[PDB]
Structure 1
Amino acid sequence: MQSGIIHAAEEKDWKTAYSYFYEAFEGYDSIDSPKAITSLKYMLLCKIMLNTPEDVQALVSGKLALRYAGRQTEALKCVAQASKNRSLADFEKALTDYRAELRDDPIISTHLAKLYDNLLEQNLIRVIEPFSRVQIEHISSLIKLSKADVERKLSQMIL
């Protein structure tokens, strides 16, 4: 689990972190409940960070995942489906719906914020190609957000 944590913070690759987290959970198989919960949470977080939520459904449908199912696990599944939908708004909705369950600063809040920034950047870049000059309130209307936050994100990207 600690090796997976270190690699997830390193952020060069997340598949090895997935391997380490799964090994830690397999060690925590119905032995230490909180450590198992943390291991599976980190495993699913790095799995969605891999931008492959399609295997998330199978992973959470696995027997051990159902055995250790919980509100935080369901929140992570909702985050995975938000990543599927590519909706930063849906991701933010899931985070607010389970905030305290995913408010943890160590590799939970940090990685969720990083992924949220990734979706913001991807949405902006995906909608920005056609426009040689576009009004930012129209951009905000397309992204379904306010003006100040969209402007701040576009700035921080372009600075």
Structure 2
Amino acid sequence: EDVQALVSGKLALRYAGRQTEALKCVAQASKNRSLADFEKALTDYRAELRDDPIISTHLAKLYDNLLEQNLIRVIEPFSRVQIEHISSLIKLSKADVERKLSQMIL
């Protein structure tokens, strides 16, 4: 929300372009804790995200944090449940989500 508010500054809006909207869409995807949205944003603007020499270094950590947030929000709304349903909703395998849940419990 801070970057979304800050990009609208007068000096900021003086420097408009397409890289700024790429960062805006990445921030919007990360705000509501959606993995698919961030993946779509990465694929749509691949010429700017995985092209600079430094952003790709931090992409992995950003992905890990986003996966944590997505798992938290998708597992929040109920209680005792299966693992097949949650893996289908998160669109992952069965072993990886189990390892991740064990690590979060630890």
Question: Under a length normalisation based on structure 1, what TM-score does the superposition of the two structures give?
Answer: 0.51
Q: 1:91 to 1:125 in 2, by over 3 A?
A: same
Q: After superposition, give the CA deviation of every residue in 1:92-141 in whole Å (9 maximum; x if it has no partner).
A: 11111111211146431222321121111222244447888754331123
CA-to-aligned-CA distance 1:11-63 (integer Å, 9 cap, x gap): xxxxxxxxxxxxxxxxxxxxxxxxxxxxxxxxxxxxxxxxxxx1222211112
Contact conserved, 1:120 with 1:153, CA < 8 A, in 2?
A: no
RMSD: 3.3
Q: What percentage of aligned pairs have identical amino acids?
A: 100
- Write the distance in 1 (CA, Å) between the matches of 2:99 and 2:50: 23
Distance change (3 Å), C-alpha of 1:89 and 1:156: farther
Deviation, structure 1 residue 77? 0.3
Distance 1:151 1:105 in 2: 34
Deviation at 1:153?
5.6
Q: Say which structure is richer in helix.
A: 1
Choose 122-131 or 79-88, whichever is displaced more: 122-131
CA distance, structure 2, for counterparts of residue 86 and residue 126 of structure 1? 7
Alignment correspondent of 2:37 = 90
State whether residues 95 and 102 of structure 1, in contact with CA within 8 Å, keep that contact through their aligned partners in structure 2. yes
Match of 2:59 in 1: 112
> How many residues are paired up?
106
With over 3 angstroms needed to count, the CA separation of the structure-2 counterparts of 1:81 and 1:127, relative to structure 1, is: closer
> Measured at CA, do residues 106 and 138 of structure 1 come closer, stay the same or move farther in structure 2, by a change above 3 Å?
same
Question: Quick one: structure 1 residues 97 and 66, their matched pair in 2 at CA, closer, same or farther if it must change by over 3 Å?
Answer: same
Q: Which runs of 5+ in 1 are unaligned?
A: 1-53
Task: Specify which structure has the bigger relative contact order, considering alpha-carbon pairs within 8 angstroms and separated by 6 or more residues.
Answer: 2
Residues 42 and 49, structure 2, Cα contact 8 Å, conserved in 1:
yes
- Unpaired segments ≥5 residues, structure 2: none
Scaled by the length of structure 2, what TM-score is found?
0.71
